[PDB]
């Protein structure tokens, strides 16, 4: 029957998903991918649905694809769901009406999550679901982890009995991924109550050959209004169904619901209509000022759609004089938002009183609705009575906004501890987390709720985790912002954040660090902390945790060091219980085992135990002093803006502090140097080369080649070492590689990869570093970068260019932004770029951080996100663009060349009109023509001069990652490409969609284990190469820098050169990957995926096609026969052959009989004599013609679909016969 | 100045369209499809628009290529329309909010159809422009041949001035195929209604190497709702 | 009982062929992403596309099906590209069955590729 | 023809267009059961999903 | 299945109309395109028959059975395989990691090796 | 003694234009649309319309 359990709303819905469904068409999007994993993971540990089967879970290529076949396997008779969000839900749209429309029993689990409009978000909100409203889905909302369990199963059981589809929502974030102790059904207790008539009728009115029917059918004006209207006595007896399961369900549960619930004041005359986890945070509040003898409430709606107003108005209470209604969305020019304009609705359609309704919006994105915003719409309602408003930001732009008080009292449940634990990424805290709030919720009958926030940065990101644990259930849905119990585990954000906020007076603050003395902490701790922890008389604790961890052989890890101080100090257990408990599950758990390591764990523990004693702090500390500024300087906009923001202020930041569409300045990054490396490489200039490579290879750009003649390192520090440099060209300068310790992530790339045995590049821990090189690279950015003196297409030659792309928050070694970072450093002042959603858009612009930055003459990539699907469309936009713009401003010049304008101007107008599409020509006179046209404001000319960032050639590149390219954003790459247009893609391959967590894609190769191919891929890798190289007038080559970097910068300039579309794909190294010996071996890896053959190089340029040359020219070598090592040294593949050894063996000679004969096809393809031939392009001329002019017989039909408005003349329809036939006819005929 | 013509109220709205337009991106869809049919064929013809130059026409694969082309269009300086309906809008939907939300003017000419849901339709009813109800966009109607004609005029023009993407819709057949005695404007009428200076600062924040901004960031908590309510203004 | 269930699924007994029919402007143009991954799943479907070269139904308008130097709406004055390979992009798989069939030339050869199709 | 030598055993997933305009714009439907009530099992989702709504029958 | 071109392209386009057309309207375009289609068809009948008479071929194993059992890609790896931010976060994620930002394991084993201390 | 309101924007929607075009005569006033939307409370329109009515508070 019941079954208790702490897990979080994705995976007690996703609990009951499987139980009752067969079928699960998927597609990965943040925040409900959890649930398709799991169903997979449970699929393939063999767990049975409630008729004994494992679910049939197969990945699309989009979320439109998965509900196409969500629509289809329920016309066909099985019961199906599937599990998505906004983006997500957005495609599944056209078909959730054809599912409705035709009265499928399907059910969609959605994660409520932000519509991307000036920005993208992956956070909360019902913006999306709002978006799906009018497609006749029934939408049952979930406020916890407790209601998403039970509404998933309502939903399930209704929609099976209805005949109506349903739409089981729950907020993204605040409810898929709160940890809450929670109990669930078993699937026997779901299965009896499944109304087997209905089920039995579903299978039996379902498509089948042996009974077959039509559907789908066009319909015209006749028919077509009954028709919609036919399905009325369904939706009419759905809330009734609803109702129904509501009380099945509570009879096994004793968990009651209705459509609409009241909660609070029964003569309440202020009330709040809301829906969401909201509601939880809603009743809470309620729960302390009725206490307090205000007369409030709330009413929860539970069944959206159908809106049933006989249930909200059962819900009211007559005693309400002021009621508001929350919306979580924004639609912009609406009279009012969804929820709100309904509930009007049902007060005018009941033509009574009228309580005078209130709008209000909140927790956009995931915007925090705390109990003080919800005291303030109150407070609104007695007061102010200010109408559609907007709660948790300060809006000074258009005033929407009610003003909130912070120091409201805490709202939480009488003996509720709060706990704030500060991590670094990768340190264990969150793990330890989950893990403590497993045992404890196992080993104590209290309420416990887990809530974590994460950085955007990739590698060395902040960690924030919210626990709370009660006697009383806890309805928190909100950050902890009265801590009782405060962890700080990395001691390096003592400086930076604000890590007692809020605190308890005589909270517990533990802190990890090694200042162990007074002067250690005096001098380490600013004073704002040292006040707070004196003011608010709270117990201090210091552990030097990297200390103990060393000292019992752990070597440095805190985790559970970090986790002995919470059981001992948090309170929420007794010392030997806790202890016991924990001992015991170190024992039960850990990473590779052997009872010598459980033994360090028990070491760890005990050393912990022992060393957890108060920081007795002077009561000085109650007047320490503020510190004198020693920092650099920096931009307005870094200062005002992006600082607040990377400090965690930025809810802070008012309306008025950004811009309306949502842009943001490039370069901020440059300012970060967030010194996050453990390791950073030294120069050692005696074996030094001078060959640029490590520059070349930093997925960072932390490595900066400095070619200065001598005039220029006057002010240069003392250790500025620079050799002399090496070079035909290079005479009188100065070599010196310099490292920015400070950008750098500590990968090892560069070291690796450079050339001499006795290394130029050598590890080093970054405070041996700093001191030395801070103030140098400081100095280093002074000098002019010398892109002049050598090819910028060369490899020396690109490291003496600006990189445009510096500092993005990719993970410390990702084999992504290597390949941008050049790119950029050959056309990045040139350069439009429409970037896929991923990685990609990740790292490239997640705010407040933006690594793309202009030269020294404010040039640089313009950069856009769409959307994941349409990247390669976005990108042929923004030249369908510069084509029509850039020949309007050549129409012009034409013009001009008529006018009394200047002999100068003429010159330089035929100049650019000769060579407007050659980058270097157009620019040429481009400038020229910025110079002599300077000041003209009327007339062709002024016009004219109003153009000139129309000048010089720009370069349209569309970058992505493979599941783009692959699967969603393939067709329309595809259609690009086959424009004939000129665009370039530049596709960074991971071989999975890395940005979401390692899910399949169609580039994924036989035998990589991955999300949806968990037990080995078992399809081989889709040659998008090709399948596109088939074209015959698309430039296509393959990549991989660590192997050569000469081929890629070739590959690069004659893909971009090439007069049409290119299509460039890099292997790219990944985490996802599981590179065994480090991310530093990208390189080396990039090398062997070469060498092996698993990914040959090679290049097809049309233009040799027209010269009667083989466009396909390979440039890897036939496989070593290193394979097998290649794959072994790879985790994605190496798993496999521990887990199931007989089918890695499989697979892994699969994939290098598959490379065999590929790279066997390659050499084939260079060596024929049969080749499509290529022409450049075709001019614009004037003229066209219809069809059908002229034709002997009828050229359209009599349908309204081929009506234009000259059809209609008499014509031939072919009812007659032949030609011949009817000439012979009447031949026959005489008469 | 006014030219009398008996037309259908695709090719009214079309007159109109082409001329206020630069680039198009295009994909068929009854009832909507002789709007894209004819631009194309008038920029064969060599037809002008207010800046004397034919239009850019492109067919993509499908709408939401479309929409994602005519986002593109707009975040590079270039006035850009499409012609649609149901099943088609739909698929725009997505692109639609982001149009929006980057106060882009872009300007979609819509024959209403209906949504296929128990069976598909060719013809008029407004469930698909009430789909894109929440994106963002102004919505403009017309009830006539004649008012194709002159909501097409308006919608074009405010979305210049205000950057407030537009969708002018008129009901499929019911109006976009009757044919009716109207009075249309000549090209240069409709040029000297434009506000150039709107024109001029939309070409200015338009993406450009030569100075370039970062378009479509990822978002949190933090700032997320600030920036959704920073529009406003605009609206 | 388990033999009661059995007899509740006759429908189901004799093996289905699941067909999949579209002509070339949702094979080539807007269908080609999903069916390029229907194909790529390695599942038991039979797609059948009536190549008209053009969208039919609609009006006329060009197809990436649509040959070089043909006349269609959006293609009027001759399509510019030439026609995209579809059978040989998918033929790039390994397990996917292709074929071309054309009544007219040979009937035989028409039943011989759906029977090997199929 | 493919109906006469599969017909009796088939799913149709008909994407929008020609196909879907003579094979089932109301009231006329052309395909037909045999002698035995088996026939095609006929139907239209979208235009963009056909090849997905018939690899879900599949399902 | 067919043979080579039979040199009637020229007579079955101009048999139809949408190649026809082009033919009265824009003659010189029209011979062009024509010739071109021509050219296309030639080099693509070559290119068939270059399959055909191949050596070289993708193999081909039927399908695969319903097996029990499934790993996670991060199960043993060396170093973090998942990343900090909220995409990648799933139930059991937070556990420690080598997240690459002390270099590779020789680099580390070596500077390890080169400060005993 | 009949009329009618003709809606020219329909987003944004601007109540103020909306009631400049009401006859403070109106007594029975039904919405028209030209959609359905299963479940909803009320189309379109008529919610929007609602709306303003009770925005207004007369
Ligand atoms: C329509 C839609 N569904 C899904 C998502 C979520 N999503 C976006 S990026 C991505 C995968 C990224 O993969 P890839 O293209 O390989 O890029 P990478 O991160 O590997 O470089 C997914 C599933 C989305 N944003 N929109
Ligand atoms: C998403 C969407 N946009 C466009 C249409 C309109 N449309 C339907 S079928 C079709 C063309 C038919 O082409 P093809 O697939 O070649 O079929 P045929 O008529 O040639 O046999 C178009 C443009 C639609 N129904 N839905
Ligand atoms: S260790 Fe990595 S991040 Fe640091 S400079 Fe070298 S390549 Fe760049
Ligand atoms: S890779 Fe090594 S040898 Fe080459 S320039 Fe860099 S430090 Fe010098
Ligand atoms: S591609 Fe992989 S290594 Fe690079 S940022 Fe993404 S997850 Fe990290
Ligand atoms: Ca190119
Ligand atoms: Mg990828
Ligand atoms: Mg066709």
Redesign the interface.
């Known amino acids: 029957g019941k079954k208790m359990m702490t897990?979080?709303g994705?995976?007690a819905t996703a609990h009951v998903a499987y139980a009752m469904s067969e079928?699960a068409?998927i597609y990965p999007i943040?925040?409900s991918?959890?649930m398709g994993?799991?169903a997979?993971?449970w699929a393939?540990?063999?767990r049975k649905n409630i008729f004994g089967q494992?679910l049939?879970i197969?990945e699309?290529?989009?979320e439109?694809?998965?509900?196409?076949?969500?629509?289809?396997?329920?016309?066909?008779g099985?019961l199906?769901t599937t599990f998505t969000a906004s983006?997500g839900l957005?495609?599944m749209?056209?078909?959730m009406?054809?599912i409705?429309?035709?009265l499928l029993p399907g059910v969609f689990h959605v994660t409520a999550r932000?519509?991307?409009?000036?920005?993208?978000?992956?956070?909360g909100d019902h913006?999306d679901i709002?978006?799906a409203?009018?497609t006749?889905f029934?939408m049952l909302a979930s406020s916890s982890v407790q209601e998403a369990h039970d509404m998933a199963l309502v939903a399930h059981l209704a929609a099976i009995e209805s005949n109506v589809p349903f739409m089981h929502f729950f907020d993204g974030?605040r409810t898929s991924?709160e940890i809450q102790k929670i109990e669930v059904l078993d699937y026997a207790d779901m299965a009896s109550l499944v109304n087997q008539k209905a089920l039995?009728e579903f299978?039996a009115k379902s498509?089948?050959?042996?009974?077959?029917?039509?559907?789908?059918?066009?319909?015209?004006?006749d028919?077509?209004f009954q028709?919609?209207?036919?399905?009325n006595p369904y939706?009419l007896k759905?809330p009734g169904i609803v109702a129904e399961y509501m009380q099945k369900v509570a009879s096994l549960t004793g968990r009651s619901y209705k459509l609409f619930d009241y909660v609070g004041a029964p003569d309440a005359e202020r009330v709040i209509v809301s829906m969401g986890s909201s509601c939880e945070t809603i009743e809470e509040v309620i729960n302390h000022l009725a206490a307090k003898g205000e007369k409030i409430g709330l009413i929860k709606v539970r069944l959206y759609?159908?809106?049933v107003?006989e249930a909200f108005f059962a819900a009211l209470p007559a005693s309400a004089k002021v009621i508001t209604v929350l919306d979580r969305?924004?639609?912009?020019?609406?009279?009012?938002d969804p929820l709100?304009?309904?509930v009007?609705?049902?007060?005018?359609?009941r033509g009574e009183a009228?309580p005078?309704?209130l709008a209000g919006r909140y927790?956009?994105?995931?915007?925090?609705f705390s109990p003080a915003m919800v005291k303030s719409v109150y407070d609104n309602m007695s007061g102010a009575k200010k109408?559609h408003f907007?709660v948790?930001?300060?809006?000074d732009?258009?005033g929407?906004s009610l003003p909130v008080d912070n120091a409201f009292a805490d709202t939480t449940p009488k003996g509720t501890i709060q706990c704030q634990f500060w991590g670094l990424?990768?340190?264990?805290?969150?793990?330890?987390?989950?893990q403590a709030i497993k045992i404890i919720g196992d080993n104590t009958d209290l309420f416990a709720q887990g809530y974590?926030?994460?950085?955007?940065?990739?590698?060395?990101?902040?960690?924030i985790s919210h626990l709370r644990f009660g006697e009383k259930p806890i309805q928190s849905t909100y950050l902890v912002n009265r801590a009782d119990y405060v962890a700080c585990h990395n001691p390096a954000y003592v400086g930076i954040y604000d890590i007692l906020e809020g605190i308890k007076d005589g909270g517990t603050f533990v802190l990890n660090s090694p200042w162990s003395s007074l002067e250690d902490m005096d001098k380490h701790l600013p004073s704002g902390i040292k006040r707070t922890i004196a003011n608010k008389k709270l117990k201090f604790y210091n552990i030097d945790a990297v200390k103990i961890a060393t000292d019992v052989g752990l070597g440095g890890?805190i985790?559970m060091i970090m986790q002995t101080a919470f059981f001992k100090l948090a309170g929420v257990l007794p010392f030997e219980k806790a202890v016991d408990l924990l001992k015991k599950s170190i024992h039960k758990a850990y990473?590779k085992k052997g009872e010598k390591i459980v033994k360090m764990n028990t070491d760890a523990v005990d050393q912990a135990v022992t060393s957890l004693q108060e920081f007795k702090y002077p009561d000085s500390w109650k007047d320490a002093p503020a510190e004198t500024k020693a920092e650099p300087m920096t931009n307005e906009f870094f200062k005002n803006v992006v600082k607040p923001?990377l400090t965690?202020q930025?809810?802070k930041?008012?309306?008025?502090?950004?811009?309306?569409?949502?842009?943001?300045?490039?370069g901020t990054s440059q300012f970060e140097k967030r010194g996050?490396?453990?390791?950073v490489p030294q120069w050692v200039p005696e074996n030094c080369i001078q060959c640029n490579q490590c520059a070349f290879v930093c997925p960072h750009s932390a490595i900066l080649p400095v070619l200065a003649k001598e005039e220029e390192l006057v002010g240069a520090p003392a250790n500025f070492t620079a050799l002399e440099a090496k070079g035909k060209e290079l005479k009188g300068y100065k070599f010196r590689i310099q490292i920015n310790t400070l950008d750098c992530?500590?990968?090892?790339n560069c070291?690796?990869i450079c050339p001499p045995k006795e290394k130029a590049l050598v590890?080093?821990?970054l405070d041996t570093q700093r001191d030395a090189q801070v103030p140098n690279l400081e100095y280093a950015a002074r000098i002019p970068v010398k892109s002049e003196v050598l090819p910028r297409d060369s490899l020396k030659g690109s490291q003496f260019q600006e990189p445009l792309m510096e500092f993005s928050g990719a993970?410390?070694?990702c084999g992504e932004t290597p390949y941008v970072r050049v790119i950029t450093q050959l056309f990045?002042?040139?350069?439009?770029i429409?970037?896929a959603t991923g990685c990609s858009?990740?790292w490239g612009?997640?705010?407040?951080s933006?690594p793309?930055k202009?030269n020294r003459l404010?040039?640089?990539?313009?950069?856009?996100?769409?959307?994941f699907?349409?990247?390669?469309?976005?990108?042929?936009?923004?030249?369908?663009?510069?084509?029509?713009?850039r020949?309007?401003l050549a129409?012009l010049a034409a013009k001009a060349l008529e006018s009394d304008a200047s002999g100068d101007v003429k010159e330089a107008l035929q100049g650019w009109l000769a060579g407007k599409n050659d980058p270097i020509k157009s620019k040429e006179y481009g400038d020229k023509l910025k110079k002599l046209l300077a000041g003209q404001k009327d007339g062709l000319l002024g016009q004219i001069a109003?153009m000139?960032?129309?000048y010089?050639k720009?370069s349209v590149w569309i970058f992505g990652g493979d599941g783009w390219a692959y699967?969603?954003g393939?067709?329309?790459l595809?259609?690009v490409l086959?424009?004939?247009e000129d665009v370039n893609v530049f596709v960074m391959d991971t071989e999975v969609y890395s940005?979401?967590?390692?899910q399949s894609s169609?580039a994924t190769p036989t035998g990589a284990?991955?999300?949806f191919a968990?037990?080995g891929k078992?399809?081989?890798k889709?040659?998008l190469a090709?399948?596109v190289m088939?074209?015959?007038?698309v430039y296509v080559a393959t990549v991989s820098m660590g192997y050569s970097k000469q081929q890629f910068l070739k590959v690069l300039k004659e893909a971009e050169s090439f007069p049409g579309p290119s299509l460039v794909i890099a292997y790219a190294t990944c985490?996802?990957q599981?590179?065994?010996?480090?991310?530093?071996?990208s390189q080396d890896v990039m090398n062997t995926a070469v060498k092996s053959g698993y990914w040959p190089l090679f290049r097809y340029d049309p233009r040799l096609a027209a010269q009667g040359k083989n466009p396909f020219q390979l440039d890897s070598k036939a496989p070593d026969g290193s394979v097998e090592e290649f794959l072994m040294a790879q985790?994605?593949f190496?798993?496999?052959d521990?887990?199931?050894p007989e089918?890695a063996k499989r697979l892994r000679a699969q994939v290098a009989?598959?490379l065999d004969?590929?790279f066997?096809?390659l050499e084939?393809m260079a060596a024929?004599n049969?080749?499509?031939?290529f022409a450049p392009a075709?001019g614009?001329?004037?003229?066209?013609?219809?069809?059908?002019?002229?034709?002997?017989f009828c050229?359209?039909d009599d349908?309204?679909?081929?009506?234009?408005?000259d059809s209609g003349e008499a014509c031939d329809q072919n009812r007659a016969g032949t030609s011949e036939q009817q000439g012979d006819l009447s031949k026959r005929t005489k008469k």
């Open positions: 897990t979080d994705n995976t079928v068409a943040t925040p991918s959890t994993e799991e997979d993971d393939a540990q063999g494992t049939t197969r699309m290529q989009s439109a694809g998965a509900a196409g076949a969500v629509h289809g396997a329920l016309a066909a099985a199906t983006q957005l495609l749209i056209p078909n009406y054809k409705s429309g035709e932000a519509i991307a409009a000036h920005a993208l978000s992956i956070f913006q709002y978006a409203r009018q006749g029934a974030f991924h039995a299978r498509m089948n050959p042996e009974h077959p029917h039509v559907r789908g059918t066009a319909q015209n004006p028919i077509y028709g919609r209207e036919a399905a939706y759905v759609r159908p809106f107003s969305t924004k639609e912009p020019g609406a009279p009012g709100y304009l309904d009007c609705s049902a007060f005018v359609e009228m005078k309704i927790g956009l994105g995931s915007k925090e109408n907007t948790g930001i300060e809006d732009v258009t929407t990424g990768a340190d264990g805290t969150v793990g330890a987390n989950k974590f926030s994460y950085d955007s940065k990739k590698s060395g990101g902040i960690t890890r985790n990473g923001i965690q930025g809810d930041l008012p309306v008025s502090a950004f811009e309306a569409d949502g842009r943001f300045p490039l996050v490396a453990i390791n992530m500590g990968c090892g070291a690796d590890m080093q821990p993970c410390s070694g990045g002042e040139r350069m439009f429409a970037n858009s990740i612009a997640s705010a407040p933006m793309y202009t404010g040039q640089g990539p313009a950069w856009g996100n769409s959307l699907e349409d990247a390669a469309e976005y990108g042929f936009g923004m030249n369908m663009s510069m084509f029509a713009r020949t309007h129409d109003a000139s960032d129309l010089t720009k699967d969603i393939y067709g329309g595809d259609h086959a424009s004939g940005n979401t967590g390692g169609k284990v991955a999300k968990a037990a078992r399809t081989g889709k040659d090709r399948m088939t074209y015959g007038y985490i996802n599981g590179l065994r010996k480090g991310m530093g071996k985790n994605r190496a798993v496999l521990r887990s199931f089918d009989h598959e004969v590929r066997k096809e084939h024929t049969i080749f499509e031939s075709g614009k001329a004037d003229g066209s013609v219809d069809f059908g002019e002229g034709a002997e050229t359209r349908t309204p679909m081929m009506a234009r408005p």
